[PDB]
């Protein structure tokens, strides 16, 4: 399917079609056009850098060491990944997004430091 | 003055988990990685485990890899080595030493220094 | 472990050297050997860190060195107080870190 | 030699000169200079994303896991990599590029999910 | 701390908090003023990002390499560099040789990627 | 209620090869891992191979790494395993069984839910 | 392989237990030790999964527990219908996925 | 015709070391990957070590995995071997060989084409 | 090493085949099998590379084949010059690069 096609579909279904939605992400009339284009470029760069400082550079999908907290979602895994849409999930965790990002970044920094120390262990 | 004490140890039958607590003082605790060294009553020394300064990395001698657990608590000056099973071989005096590894930003140590007094652990 | 003598003999007025041999894969490849002197009623201590360097608080009498697959340690003029068993260690590798040798009981006459 | 230093040379002699070319991709006039610069940045970002969705991010050279269907080309390794220029090669396989890209993306996607399953195994 | 919090700190403490800087590198004639300001900022960031990625160091901030450290650039043992110095003085010190560092890094990464592909060539 | 049936050769000669097939019906075969397990005629059970639901991964005991190869068709709802250059220890009853590992996205399983009637394999 | 008793006996109305033990790497680390029943010459059936979870359609009389390196399965009532062989199934990480023990015989009087 | 001069020679104590050299002509020294193959006086031949064309990669057998070190010099068209420690079994005729590996740009070879006259290493 | 007969024999004008037996990872994993001859005291020479392809400058007479975990070298009516020791070889394992075979004395008679 095409752009945004799995938006209403199941979590599991939409989790297989990330690329189709990632590639389609990216005189005054020229002024507004360039402003919009630079804004879109800067937003893609936002996301790219934010993934880069998470150890997930260049992978559309990426696992990390930060453990889940039942406070964020008291949700059975089957419900999340086979019953509940992506939009409802973004809505549900919209409150707690920032703390997830902070913990994830801290874990990535700690992982980089540990990797550097291990590489020198000789 | 750099000084290390150990607490815990003594009689422990096989199976009952036990922990040694080494307390270090007189120096910047967070700046050094730490090792445990076993000395049997009659045999020589033998490295057991090594833990980095930050407390993330851990390594153990292959013989007791799945049975030991080393941990730091930089908030209050301590070092907890907790192990289970405690087979007959684990009958020796354990020494809490500092050194053996460096954070890769300082001069490489690769040895242990200012050794502690040591605490005896026995198995019936 | 490292092939080292169970004991050595050395009288006051002369120099005695202790040898400790291992394998090139651990001592020959890595220039990290450490020498310790444990008094039987006391914990060990560092007489020579690295092949040659000496930590502060140790007299010049101790003097280490390495060659091939053997680490040597010389004590210069001996005294009665230096009656304490010796031990050699080295960075074996990222899989096995440190391997300690046997105990050498020197004798001062 | 320099920019496009070995463009007409043999294949391999160009294969180790990629860094220079990769590096050299970055009112009446101000608006046009802005248009050209932002077009360049968009082109670079599109190339980087196309590489990233294939797992080859950050490496000029890379390796993939798609078999080479000989329909696209049947020339053996010596003929291509000792007696041919890059321009001729791009001319030869012009139609099939799209197909290749599609397969490449798909392979990465398959590989990626496989990797996640391995990281899921306890 | 926040932006440039460890501006004058010792090397290790500043290196521990490299993420805040990395994040902060990104954000009618005033129209074109802001447009060229922002595009110049984006271009500088992307140039630095590509200059990292050409070394295989993209996707990381603490990236390790294999260029031998020629002592001619500086003979300061690690204690001074990593416990008794700030980033500004250090950058002042190796300003005259940073280009050679970049070139050596290019060569080393090229050899390493070629060797990696060669290893993968084995069946 | 799921029917899990099998078919394959029973008698063979040493140094040859065979292909066991498994047919399943009564559920979503595409969302379930599969696994080949064996039990010797007198002895206990023994895991042989494990296959993920998408049919991309493979896993084997160390015994038959270079000899066995297990695949699965998802649309036809079928599994297969080709054994090459089999030895006499393989003489046993082979059972198909669902489960073994989840697909990283649903609940962890680590067991064998359904068990078919099996099929005996023997070699001269 | 794992270690289980070869056989057990008991009368209806009481309860019996069967143990399964192995290395600390598998049983101690992971609480994934299932129990299967195989009637004589019949297809096996899954009686317990994980350490305690009971499958749909399985009687309450079957129960399980894990203690350290050991895992026990307890059967109550013993209506004599389950005159079948019992096996344990331990998950042991990667490269060693599932291991079993000596076949257990449950005798019913 | 392609010719592979080998100077080499054998005269060393069992615990000693000895350097081998091999100069090849009649072809592009660069575009091939070289190797060392040993043959004891009466036994079957055996591969020693391998170096790729660029010289940035190398491989050894498990017998001398951590002992020998083979390198190359492309501009001067020389293959160098450095032995270390040694073991009385080494006594054999060592031959230089071209092939056994080739870069991904070239076609796979996996064999040895041109074999030099080698030299006999002698252990005192 | 690779299992193959220590020695064989034949007569002029009669084709002779020699076998070379290997394990699963040895020959079956990769179809890269080669045969090298050496005359007494002479540096070996490559006779065939891969299963069937033959080098330039080699006689048509020599030929190769592969079946299962085994390979074979077939030669036509033996000339007076085809007396050598022939060695089987293959690429088998990323770590263990090259495993060779024992001697094969073709006793022309
Ligand atoms: C919409 O949901 C129904 C079930 O309610 C499902 O059958 C159908 O496939 C879904 N469509 C998409 C596009 O996901
Ligand atoms: C889970 O979230 C609650 C609410 O913020 C917090 O108190 C608790 O510490 C969190 N636990 C973890 C492990 O993050
Ligand atoms: C998950 O939790 C819900 C909570 O009601 C439960 O009913 C359901 O059975 C669980 N589903 C699973 C494990 O698939
Ligand atoms: C999010 O925040 C609002 C505002 O504090 C709060 O009232 C609400 O309960 C939160 N929503 C969720 C879904 O946690
Ligand atoms: C150009 O072609 C000639 C042969 O005509 C060849 O020798 C030379 O190397 C080529 N030059 C380049 C730069 O590829
Ligand atoms: C594309 O196909 C046309 C028609 O066969 C042909 O002329 C052209 O050369 C092809 N180009 C390629 C394969 O690059
Ligand atoms: C500045 O130097 C002094 C040295 O003790 C210290 O108080 C302070 O933390 C240093 N910090 C910064 C941020 O420069
Ligand atoms: C190190 O740099 C100096 C100049 O600073 C130069 O003379 C010397 O050759 C270099 N040594 C190396 C790269 O080993
Ligand atoms: C570093 O070198 C200086 C001299 O340049 C010396 O004073 C200092 O003690 C050295 N530190 C270490 C840790 O070697």
Q: Would you mind describing this structure in some detail?
A:
This is part of a larger assembly, with three copies of chain A, three copies of chain B (124 residues) and three copies of chain C (109 residues). Chain A is an all-alpha fold and 122 residues long. Chain A has one domain (4-119). Chain A is built from six helices and no strands. By secondary structure, chain B is mainly β. In chain B, strands 2, 4, 5, 6, 9, 10 and 11 form a seven-stranded mixed sheet that branches. In chain B, strands 1-3-8-7 form a four-stranded antiparallel sheet, with no helix packed on it. Chain B has no helices and eleven strands. Chain B has a single domain (3-123), classed as Immunoglobulin-like (Sandwich), CATH 2.60.40. Chain C is mainly beta and 109 residues long. Chain C has one domain. Chain A binds chain E through residues 28, 31, 34-35, 38, 41-42, 45-46, 49, 52-53, 55, 57-58, 105, 109, 112-113, 115-116, 119-120, and chain E through 16, 18-19, 22-23, 25-28, 31-32, 35, 38-39, 42, 45-46, 58-62, 64. Residues 92-96 of chain D line the site of one 2-acetamido-2-deoxy-beta-D-glucopyranose. Chain E: Residues 92-123 form a coiled coil. Chain E: Residues 1-13 are annotated as: Fusion peptide. Chain E: This is Transmembrane protein gp41.
For the structure shown, list the relevant keywords.
part of a larger assembly, 9 chains, A: 122 residues, mainly alpha, globular, B: 124 residues, mainly beta, Immunoglobulin-like, seven-stranded mixed β-sheet, four-stranded antiparallel β-sheet, binds 2-acetamido-2-deoxy-beta-D-glucopyranose, viral protein, sosip, clinical trial
């Amino acid at each position: 399917l095409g752009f945004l096609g799995a938006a209403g579909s199941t979590m599991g279904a939409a989790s297989m079609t990330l690329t189709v939605q990632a590639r389609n992400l990216l005189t005054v009339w020229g002024i507004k056009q360039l402003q919009a284009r630079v804004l879109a470029v800067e937003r893609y760069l936002r996301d790219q850098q934010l993934l880069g400082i998470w150890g997930c550079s260049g992978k559309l999908i990426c696992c990390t060491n930060v453990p889940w907290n039942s406070s964020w979602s008291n949700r059975n895994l089957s419900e999340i990944w086979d019953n509940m849409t992506w939009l409802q999930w973004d809505k549900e965790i919209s409150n707690y997004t920032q703390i997830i990002y902070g913990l994830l970044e801290e874990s990535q920094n700690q992982q980089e430091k540990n990797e550097q120390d291990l590489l020198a262990l000789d | 003055e750099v000084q290390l004490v150990e607490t815990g140890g003594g009689l422990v039958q096989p199976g009952g988990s036990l922990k040694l607590s080494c307390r270090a003082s007189g120096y910047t605790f967070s700046s050094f990685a730490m090792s445990w060294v076993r000395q049997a009553p009659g045999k020589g020394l033998e490295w057991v485990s090594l833990i980095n300064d930050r407390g993330g990395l851990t390594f153990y001698v292959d013989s007791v890899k799945g049975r030991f657990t080393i941990s730091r608590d930089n908030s209050k000056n301590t070092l907890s080595l907790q192990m289970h099973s405690l087979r007959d071989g684990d009958t020796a005096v354990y020494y809490c030493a500092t050194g053996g590894m460096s954070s890769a930003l300082q001069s490489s140590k690769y040895y242990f220094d200012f050794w502690g007094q040591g605490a005896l652990v026995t198995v019936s | 472990a490292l092939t080292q003598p169970p004991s050595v003999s050395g009288s006051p007025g002369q120099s005695v050297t202790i040898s400790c041999t291992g394998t090139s894969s651990d001592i020959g490849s890595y220039n990290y050997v450490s020498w310790y002197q444990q008094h039987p009623g006391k914990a060990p201590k560092l007489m020579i860190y690295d092949v040659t360097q000496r930590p502060s608080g140790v007299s010049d009498r101790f003097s280490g060195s390495k060659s091939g697959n053997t680490a040597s340690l010389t004590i210069s003029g001996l005294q009665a107080d230096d009656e304490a068993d010796y031990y050699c260690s080295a960075y074996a590798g990222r899989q096995t870190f440190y391997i300690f040798g046997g105990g050498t009981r020197l004798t001062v006459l």
